[PDB]
Amino acid sequence: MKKLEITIRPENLEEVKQILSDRGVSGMTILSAMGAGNQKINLLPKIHVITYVKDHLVGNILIDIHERLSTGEVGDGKVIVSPLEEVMRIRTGERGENALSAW
Amino acid sequence: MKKLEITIRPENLEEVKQILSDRGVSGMTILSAMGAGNQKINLLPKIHVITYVKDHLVGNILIDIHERLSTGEVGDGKVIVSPLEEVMRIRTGERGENALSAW
Amino acid sequence: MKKLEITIRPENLEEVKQILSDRGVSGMTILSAMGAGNQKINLLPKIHVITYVKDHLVGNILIDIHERLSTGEVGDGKVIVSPLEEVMRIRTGERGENALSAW
Numbered sequence: 154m155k156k157l158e159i160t161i162r163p164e165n166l167e168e169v170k171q172i173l174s175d176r177g178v179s180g181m182t183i184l185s186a187m188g189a190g191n192q193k194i195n196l197l198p199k200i201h202v203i204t205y206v207k208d209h210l211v212g213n214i215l216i217d218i219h220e221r222l223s224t225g226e227v228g229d230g231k232v233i234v235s236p237l238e239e240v241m242r243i244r245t246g247e248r249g250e251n252a253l254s255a256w
Numbered sequence: 257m258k259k260l261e262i263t264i265r266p267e268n269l270e271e272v273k274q275i276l277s278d279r280g281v282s283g284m285t286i287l288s289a290m291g292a293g294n295q296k297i298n299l300l301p302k303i304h305v306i307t308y309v310k311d312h313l314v315g316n317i318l319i320d321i322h323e324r325l326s327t328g329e330v331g332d333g334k335v336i337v338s339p340l341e342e343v344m345r346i347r348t349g350e351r352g353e354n355a356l357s358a359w
Numbered sequence: 360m361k362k363l364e365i366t367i368r369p370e371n372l373e374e375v376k377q378i379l380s381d382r383g384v385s386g387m388t389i390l391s392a393m394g395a396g397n398q399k400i401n402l403l404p405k406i407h408v409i410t411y412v413k414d415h416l417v418g419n420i421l422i423d424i425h426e427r428l429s430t431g432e433v434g435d436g437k438v439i440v441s442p443l444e445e446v447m448r449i450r451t452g453e454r455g456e457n458a459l460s461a462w
């Protein structure tokens with residue numbers, strides 16, 4: 154399993170929720186943020202989306218996010234992929250890929 | 257050392273602080289969030305807790321969180337475990353497990 | 360590439376932005392938080408800064424943060440370093456170190 158961190162323009166949150174639903178993804182945690190980078194130190198409002206996903210889905214999610222969110226204007230955002238050693242569902246104590254099931 | 261990310265119902269924050277104190281954990285950083293998943297895309301309020309811990313404590317913290325927070329109702333939340341390559345205390349410049357000491 | 364998580368007193372955010380600019384770092388995402396630890400469970404306001412950086416810069420950024428932010432008073436904060444498997448720029452679809460370029 155992998156962690157995705159998706160940092161976007163807030164207006165693009167609906168489209169990120171749809172991309173993850175369209176790949177069977179079970180859930181997501183959304184944080185408000187301020188970001189700085191190339192867009193013109195100017196801070197701008199951002200949404201930071203965290204989702205845990207099965208390893209075979211990551212490549213298609215990254216392609217989907219570029220194809221559907223790109224505006225060709227500076228500031229569209231970033232996606233990173235990082236490793237997960239253990240995942241647990243609090244309600245059941247289930248570990249591994251069972252912890253992300255649709256139920 | 258490992259990073260835990262604990263995503264919970266906000267009413268359960270007091271019990272997460274007590275579980276970490278009961279395992280000698282030095283600290284925690286708390287973020288407000290909105291989450292989507294199985295509970296009935298409906299966004300619901302969540303707390304996202306980050307804590308850095310010694311590797312031998314992770315198994316007992318995961319057991320404690322399942323045993324004390326489970327309600328057997330959908331939406332109790334998730335815990336993940338991920339790797340840490342370096343940890344530094346800003347005040348002293350100390351690295352490694354010394355950076356998390358109680359002082 | 361590596362992820363840094365920098366958890367600080369809010370008054371120190373200007374100095375963290377300057378340290379990252381002084382090492383050529385392209386950007387940063389800023390989250391408001393509450394933290395608990397050694398400082399006197401008392402919750403205190405914090406800023407949580409996430410930045411993605413090239414591996415050869417991490418050692419000098421950690422030294423800079425200790426030298427410029429240390430007050431020798433408990434509560435100055437923490438820096439962690441964690442691994443990144445993939446980085447993508449949404450606007451272009453570019454991966455790897457190209458995804459963090461100044462443009």
Ligand SMILES: Nc1ncnc2c1ncn2[C@@H]1O[C@H](COP(=O)(O)OP(=O)(O)O)[C@@H](O)[C@H]1O
Pocket residue numbers: 160187188189190191192197199226227228229230231384385386387388409410411412448449450459462
């Ligand atoms: N090195 C970085 N680390 C973390 N977040 C970054 C980094 N660079 C950019 N970001 C985030 O992505 C947002 C957009 O980045 P920006 O450089 O303006 O756009 P682009 O990626 O289109 O060149 C920023 O406002 C910030 O939230």
Ligand SMILES: Nc1ncnc2c1ncn2[C@@H]1O[C@H](COP(=O)(O)OP(=O)(O)O)[C@@H](O)[C@H]1O
Pocket residue numbers: 178179180181182203204205206242243244253256263290291292293294295300302329330331332333334
């Ligand atoms: N795949 C996921 N990635 C990240 N956060 C998730 C994921 N699935 C669920 N969550 C988080 O956990 C919360 C509860 O999940 P939910 O599916 O409703 O409960 P359960 O785990 O009891 O089936 C969500 O509101 C969200 O914050």
Ligand SMILES: Nc1ncnc2c1ncn2[C@@H]1O[C@H](COP(=O)(O)OP(=O)(O)O)[C@@H](O)[C@H]1O
Pocket residue numbers: 281282283284285306307308309345346347356359366393394395396397398403405432433434435436437
């Ligand atoms: N184990 C920990 N995991 C995550 N964040 C931590 C941890 N310990 C401390 N912190 C964060 O760093 C802040 C300052 O830590 P504190 O223990 O008061 O200072 P010091 O590091 O100077 O002893 C906390 O308020 C919290 O945000």
